[PDB]
Amino acid sequence: RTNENDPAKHGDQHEGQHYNISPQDLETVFPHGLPPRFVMQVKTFSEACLMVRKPALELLHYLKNTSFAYPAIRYLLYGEKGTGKTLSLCHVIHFCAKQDWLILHIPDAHLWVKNCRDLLQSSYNKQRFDQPLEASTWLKNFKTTNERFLNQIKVQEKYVWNKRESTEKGSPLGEVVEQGITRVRNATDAVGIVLKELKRQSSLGMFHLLVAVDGINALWGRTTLKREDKSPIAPEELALVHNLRKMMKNDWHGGAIVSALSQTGSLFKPRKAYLPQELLGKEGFDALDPFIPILVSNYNPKEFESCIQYYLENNWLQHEKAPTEEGKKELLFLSNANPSLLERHCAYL
RNA sequence: AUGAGGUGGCAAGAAAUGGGCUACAUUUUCUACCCCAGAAAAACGAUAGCCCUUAUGAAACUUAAGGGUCGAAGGUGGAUUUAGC
Numbered sequence: 403r404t405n406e407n408d409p410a411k412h413g414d415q416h417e418g419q420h421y422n423i424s425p426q427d428l429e430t431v432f433p434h435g436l437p438p439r440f441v442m443q444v445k446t447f448s449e450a451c452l453m454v455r456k457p458a459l460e461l462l463h464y465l466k467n468t469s470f471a472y473p474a475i476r477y478l479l480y481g482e483k484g485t486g487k488t489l490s491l492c493h494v495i496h497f498c499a500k501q502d503w504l505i506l507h508i509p510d511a512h513l514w515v516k517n518c519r520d521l522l523q524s525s526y527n528k529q530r531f532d533q534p535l536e537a538s539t540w541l542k543n544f545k546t547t548n549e550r551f552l553n554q555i556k557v558q559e560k561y562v563w564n565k566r567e568s569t570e571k572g573s574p575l576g577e578v579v580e581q582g583i584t585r586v587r588n589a590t591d592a593v594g595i596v597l598k599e600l601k602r603q604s605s606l607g608m609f610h611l612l613v614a615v616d617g618i619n620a621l622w623g624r625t626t627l628k629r630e631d632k633s634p635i636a637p638e639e640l641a642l643v644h645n646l647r648k649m650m651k652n653d654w655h656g657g658a659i660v661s662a663l664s665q666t667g668s669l670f671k672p673r674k675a676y677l678p679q680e681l682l683g684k685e686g687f688d689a690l691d692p693f694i695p696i697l698v699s700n701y702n703p704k705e706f707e708s709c710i711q712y713y714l715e716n717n718w719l720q721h722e723k724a725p726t727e728e729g730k731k732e733l734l735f736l737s738n739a740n741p742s743l744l745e746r747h748c749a750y751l
Numbered sequence: 752a753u754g755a756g757g758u759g760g761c762a763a764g765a766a767a768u769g770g771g772c773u774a775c776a777u778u779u780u781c782u783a784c785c786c787c788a789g790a791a792a793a794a795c796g797a798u799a800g801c802c803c804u805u806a807u808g809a810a811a812c813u814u815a816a817g818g819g820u821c822g823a824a825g826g827u828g829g830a831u832u833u834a835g836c
């Protein structure tokens with residue numbers, strides 16, 4: 403536990419201690435993305451406490467040393483399953499949001515590339531496919547996270563939604579987002595327009611952009627979605643995926659592209675694929691490189707004690723032997739300091 | 752000719768019954784995977800029927816296999832009753 407709640411002052415001195423996110427900030431900045439199990443824990447406890455760690459502090463120092471004049475640099479948080487990459491990305495997202503950044507956050511790319519009942523054909527490009535439901539979902543999440551910047555940011559082009567309906571240069575980005583949401587048919591197109599406008603305006607310096615993409619390995623992998631002829635679909639055929647790759651490019655400046663690999667839900671990948679190349683594949687490695695790889699691993703004994711004491715204080719560990727050092731040692735044995743295994747045991751312990 | 756040889760052919764269903772397989776689903780449907788996920792959920796449910804193609808073969812309505820098609824009965828079951836330490 404730390405008294406410091408501002409995400410710009412805390413550093414290594416706070417290592418091994420929880421950092422609280424207020425409910426209002428959780429709602430605004432993080433209406434999505436956060437792991438389902440941590441969401442259940444937050445619902446149970448009324449406390450969104452993430453222990454600060456070297457990975458998150460490192461990437462915060464990276465973003466403080468970043469020069470927006472530089473073309474946006476890529477960072478890649480990689481590791482095994484349940485090492486907390488998602489929560490580190492969320493922590494840094496909170497930092498940038500409190501720093502007034504525009505957070506272009508992708509909660510998970512695995513969802514975008516599977517189980518898409520609504521798969522129409524993009525009007526803007528008849529050779530691609532749209533995912534109106536997911537487009538609307540992410541548009542709503544982005545609006546929730548950056549409503550303030552939504553109005554402040556204007557468009558710089560004419561965008562035709564129908565033969566008679568269009569949006570005009572200089573209009574606020576709110577008009578585009580509203581069109582995408584209400585007119586779900588235009589959802590993917592609005593997502594692409596938003597990505598383009600945010601990229602160009604970050605280049606112009608209207609704000610500072612953090613492109614925080616979770617499970618980035620999905621983009622350059624494979625897809626299970628099948629055409630009306632049952633043919634397989636490659637990722638580029640998904641306008642969302644192609645636009646997200648365009649964003650993953652570093653050609654633009656005015657921000658940084660942070661990403662976090664995630665095997666959870668990955669397609670055709672064996673359970674043990676956790677290395678950057680093994681996940682991204684040749685195409686993904688080639689697209690991301692250059693990148694700064696940051697490892698996320700199990701807990702150390704200090705952070706293990708911090709997590710256990712957090713659960714004990716919250717009384718989550720309602721069993722009698724949980725405070726006992728023997729129970730602590732058994733938890734360490736079973737979870738090998740793995741955050742996800744530890745929590746998935748503590749849930750019924 | 753109650754012996755021998757050659758060509759062609761039914762191998763069906765009022766009705767009952769024995770055994771087996773598949774189900775009626777949510778402990779399920781589906782993918783990935785081979786067990787830390789996302790969808791389906793009145794859809795589940797035919798190895799049956801119809802058409803086409805492929806393998807075998809001299810010969811495929813005859814057999815088997817693959818695709819499409821159709822999505823039927825049924826929603827845990829009567830008399831009763833089988834097997835297992």
Ligand SMILES: Nc1ncnc2c1ncn2[C@@H]1O[C@H](COP(=O)(O)OP(=O)(O)OP(=O)(O)O)[C@@H](O)[C@H]1O
Binds near residue numbers: 440482664741
């Ligand atoms: N810094 C942290 N503060 C609090 N809890 C944490 C922290 N890091 C990890 N945990 C706990 O670890 C659990 C497991 O993390 P989780 O699996 O969601 O992360 P991940 O790195 O995205 O992994 P996965 O590959 O499983 O998606 C989280 O639910 C959370 O309870």
Ligand SMILES: Nc1nc2c(ncn2[C@@H]2O[C@H](COP(=O)(O)OP(=O)(O)O)[C@@H](O)[C@H]2O)c(=O)[nH]1
Binds near residue numbers: 594641
């Ligand atoms: N409906 C619509 N969509 C647009 C328009 N302009 C841009 N977009 C969307 O914004 C995305 C980015 O556009 P852009 O990169 O310039 O097109 P591309 O380079 O040819 O792929 C596209 O995928 C479109 O879906 C427009 O005028 N109308």
Ligand SMILES: [Mg+2]
Binds near residue numbers: 437487490
């Ligand atoms: Mg994570």
